Amino acid sequence: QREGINASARYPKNWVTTGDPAREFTMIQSAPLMLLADPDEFVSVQLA
Amino acid sequence: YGDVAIVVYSGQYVENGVKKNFLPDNTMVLGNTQARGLRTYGCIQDADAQREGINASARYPKNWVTTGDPAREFTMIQSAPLMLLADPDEFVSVQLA
């Protein structure tokens, strides 16, 4: 939000925490909300 | 003393609250100056150091400051000393009395 890159595909961020057991972590932020505006276009048939 | 070199050592170090000489009262060491030792240092177990690859190092300064409301920074040093020797028999130790 500070960087202004809120809207994107993927947000990788790698950083190391402070303190004596200083260890590094990686984050992969995303918010996929894939949709289809023509639901009735597709027809699914369960065969039997 | 002819062929052997004579020295007198008096170095001290400070333990928890007091000082003391490195050597006990009366020690005598037959040694050779040409004997080879090892100042070996292990890999710095530090993720931050490994971020830029300083695995094998003599020393490792490091500084950081805590976040949040309390603000206070630190000084950090890391090393893995393994002072070693080539041959053990080339040195002879005698406790005088």
């Binding site: 890159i5 809207a7 994107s8 993927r10 947000y11 990788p12 961020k13 790698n14 950083w15 | 830029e52």
Partner: protein
């Protein structure tokens, strides 16, 4: 081969030059620029068109 000179020059907006996937910069790679031991630039990570941002 329809032209005598096959070379073409394209200017590129700086916003198209950055670290790929916005990865964190390292000692040698900074903002998508490859830096050697001597500080000379080596390579550039360029993105394609960003319009629409879709």
């Amino acid at each position: 081969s329809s032209r005598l000179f096959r070379t073409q020059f394209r200017m590129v907006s700086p916003k198209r030059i950055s670290n790929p996937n916005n990865t964190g910069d390292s000692r040698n790679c900074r903002a998508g620029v490859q830096i050697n031991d001597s500080g000379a630039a080596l390579g550039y990570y360029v993105s394609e068109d960003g319009y629409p941002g879709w």
